[PDB]
Design a protein around this ligand. Structure first.
Ligand SMILES: NC(=O)c1ccc[n+]([C@@H]2O[C@H](COP(=O)([O-])OP(=O)(O)OC[C@H]3O[C@@H](n4cnc5c(N)ncnc54)[C@H](OP(=O)(O)O)[C@@H]3O)[C@@H](O)[C@H]2O)c1
Ligand SMILES: NC(=O)c1ccc[n+]([C@@H]2O[C@H](COP(=O)([O-])OP(=O)(O)OC[C@H]3O[C@@H](n4cnc5c(N)ncnc54)[C@H](OP(=O)(O)O)[C@@H]3O)[C@@H](O)[C@H]2O)c1
Ligand SMILES: C[C@]12CC[C@@H]3c4ccc(O)cc4CC[C@H]3[C@@H]1C[C@H](Cc1cccc(C(N)=O)c1)[C@@H]2O
Ligand SMILES: C[C@]12CC[C@@H]3c4ccc(O)cc4CC[C@H]3[C@@H]1C[C@H](Cc1cccc(C(N)=O)c1)[C@@H]2O
Lengths: 284, 284
């Protein structure tokens, strides 16, 4: 009788807060499969489930590495109810630093998890939704998928890629009754903002002094933007529930309107000149 | 004394026509390293060089697989003049079909060549430009990097990714005196439009009947768009030369204005609803 939800990337942040928001819903409408790359990281998902008092049987954890199509197929197999009514593609990696300072493996990894991983989910789960003629897909997006940010070149590349992927799919899926939406997040208060950049010694080793200095300047500024604009994952989760509930969902939901001016400026000078000038000024 | 140009992907199409346009320039200002994945494919680059009568010493071929950072490093080593004044990132793969019908290897390949490959070029060549405080980078872009097209989900993902990569980099590079521009191509008359989709038997095997039917409909329409809008690589090459010559280059050049309305519609409804509705109507 329940809405079956499968979420990727639940060990922390938005995926964690969404899974237990859904599982602990006063109305008990949702059966949640919360998936994680590594089950050793599953504790917080249980600390928090106990805190919001999720009913027994509301929340099931599954191991699911989105780099591995056999792992995607094994997690699907484990969906006893034999359908997924809501698929949430949220697993993601960050990467921050001078481009020439990033390892080639890390670059490939970010693309594999953020982009190919989402493809793998969609390949494995869309066919059955198209046949039932129903289903909702919610993809965690970013404002860095809508505008480019210095030192986030690869991260932005992976989030722009998701815009292209999802927008392309949406044009097709429209008459199938399968709804795909991006939830476009600005800065969110989670953990992310030191885990994903090397040591100062490492970075200086791999770039010039002037680039290093501009990286410090970007970081300082980034910290201020987070301090003034970062939303909690509670607020973010609730936008996913809005999309999930809309009878006619749009391709994009924004968790904040704050960056929509910047976006408009981007969008009305397609030479990119005004955007690049404005953002250079703003960051540096 | 000459402008040193290194171009990736020269065996056919834009990269081929650009390399020999530059090499055969009446003024002889340009020394061209034309790179190819496979030297067995280098003949047309010589048939055409003979046709436009390129001087001896204008055009040098090099083997360069952008999937392989050792290959990138070997091609760089071979740049006798010890600098590159113009780097042209043009190597690219296409991929066309229902998403669930695309092999996981082909998906990874398109991202590796189109996105990671361009990163590898930039990692290998930008550092020296930043130090000299000069250099031009020209990246072949696509209108499918600015708007999503059904059945081009992965292709579009890879071209959106390039927008994110290049835009991010441009915000940083502005005060370095290194200029990065995307050349945004609509349909171009080359070879591409059958090489990159499976047999009808293969595709039907891998999708539903309704998706298959919509794929036929998209293809029919695509053929009409090409028949009415496709530009020759001569026209396209000349936009690269425009960018190369501009004293103050912008982030984007468009080879046609034709899709700029469609783009504006995209850009002024950030819910994506108007775009997805318009494009669904237009394609189907
Ligand atoms: N953090 C922010 O400031 C912020 C801002 C805007 C948008 N977002 C977006 O939200 C998403 C997640 O960010 P978040 O920290 O807020 O939430 P999140 O739910 O923690 O997502 C990041 C997650 O990716 C998962 N992951 C990493 N590698 C994986 C793999 N190989 N396979 C499967 N999952 C993997 C991790 O846990 P598992 O063990 O579960 O897999 C981790 O939970 C991203 O797509 C990002 O765009 C975040
Ligand atoms: N064709 C169109 O209709 C059209 C339209 C809009 C934009 N464009 C853009 O222009 C670019 C090329 O298209 P084109 O056919 O017109 O010109 P192109 O110069 O032929 O580019 C495609 C090329 O990629 C190269 N390539 C493939 N795999 C490679 C690898 N592993 N390493 C290095 N190079 C590899 C191929 O030759 P090599 O042997 O040289 O490597 C091939 O020449 C793309 O980035 C595309 O966005 C084309
Ligand atoms: C792009 C962004 C919205 C725009 C923000 C902005 C706006 C204006 C401005 O002037 C500066 C800034 C800097 C911060 C920017 C946010 C970064 C954040 C995404 C994020 C989070 C964690 C790790 C990574 C990574 N690994 O790369 C990336 C969010 O999506
Ligand atoms: C995206 C596009 C501009 C917009 C065009 C359009 C506009 C309006 C419309 O209604 C239909 C269409 C269909 C054709 C569209 C072009 C495709 C082309 C890129 C390309 C070339 C060769 C192979 C692939 C691949 N492997 O995926 C991709 C060019 O970049």
């Amino acid at each position: 009788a329940r809405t079956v939800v499968l979420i990727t990337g639940c060990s922390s942040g938005i995926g964690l807060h969404l899974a237990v928001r859904l599982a602990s819903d006063p109305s008990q409408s949702f059966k949640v499969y919360a998936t994680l790359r590594d089950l050793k990281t599953q504790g917080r998902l249980w600390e928090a489930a106990r805190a919001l008092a999720c009913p027994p049987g509301s929340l099931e954890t599954l191991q699911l590495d989105v780099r591995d199509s056999k792992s995607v197929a094994a997690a699907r197999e484990r969906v006893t109810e034999g359908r997924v009514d809501v698929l949430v593609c949220n697993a993601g990696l960050g990467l921050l630093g001078p481009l020439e300072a990033l390892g080639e493996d890390a670059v490939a990894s970010v693309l594999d998890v953020n982009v190919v991983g989402t493809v793998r989910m969609l390949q494995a789960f869309l066919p059955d939704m198209k046949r039932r003629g129903s289903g909702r897909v919610l993809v965690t997006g970013s404002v860095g998928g809508l505008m480019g940010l210095p030192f986030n070149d690869v991260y932005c590349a992976s989030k722009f890629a998701l815009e292209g992927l999802c927008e392309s799919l949406a044009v097709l899926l429209l008459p199938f009754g399968v709804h795909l939406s991006l939830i476009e997040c600005g800065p969110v208060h989670t953990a992310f903002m030191e885990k994903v950049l090397g040591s100062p010694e490492e970075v200086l080793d791999r770039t010039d002094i002037h680039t290093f200095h501009r990286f410090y300047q970007y970081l300082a500024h980034s910290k201020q933007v987070f301090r003034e604009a970062a939303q909690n994952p509670e607020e973010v989760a609730e936008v996913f529930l809005t999309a999930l509930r809309a009878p006619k969902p749009t391709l994009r939901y924004f968790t904040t309107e704050r960056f929509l001016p910047l976006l408009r400026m981007r969008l009305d000078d397609p030479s990119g000149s005004n955007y690049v000038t404005a953002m250079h000024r703003e960051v540096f």
